């Protein structure tokens, strides 16, 4: 594949307290499709820095931030895998 453009952290989620932030999410078949959409910024208005793939519900979340962003917290979630675009990891 090409998911090799992301740093994977299993059983992890990203949280950021902010009522004025709607997180893009859709049902998908695999993390791979989520990855392609993120690197290409497919139908986003923002720049995707990371995405979480929900293995249980088969869906992903695309974020305009990653774990090193200000105010973003890394959390534990058994069915969630966090993927961070290496271009934004310093």
From Swiss-Prot:
Domain of life: Eukaryota
Domain named PAN: residues: 1-87
Disulfide bonds: 34-60, 38-48
Name this polypeptide is given: Hepatocyte growth factor alpha chain
Protein's organism: Mus musculus (Mouse)
The organism's taxonomic lineage, starting at the top: Eukaryota, Metazoa, Chordata, Craniata, Vertebrata
Residues of the full protein shown: 38 to 127 of 728
């Amino acid at each position: 594949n090409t998911l090799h453009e992301f740093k994977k952290s299993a059983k992890t989620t990203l949280t950021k307290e902010d009522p004025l932030l709607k997180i893009k999410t859709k049902k998908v078949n695999s993390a791979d499709e989520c990855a392609n959409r993120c690197i290409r910024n497919r139908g986003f208005t923002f720049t995707c820095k990371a995405f979480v793939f929900d293995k249980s519900r088969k869906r992903c979340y695309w974020y305009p931030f990653n774990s090193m962003s200000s105010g973003v917290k890394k959390g534990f979630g058994h069915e969630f895998d966090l993927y961070e675009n290496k271009d934004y990891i310093r």
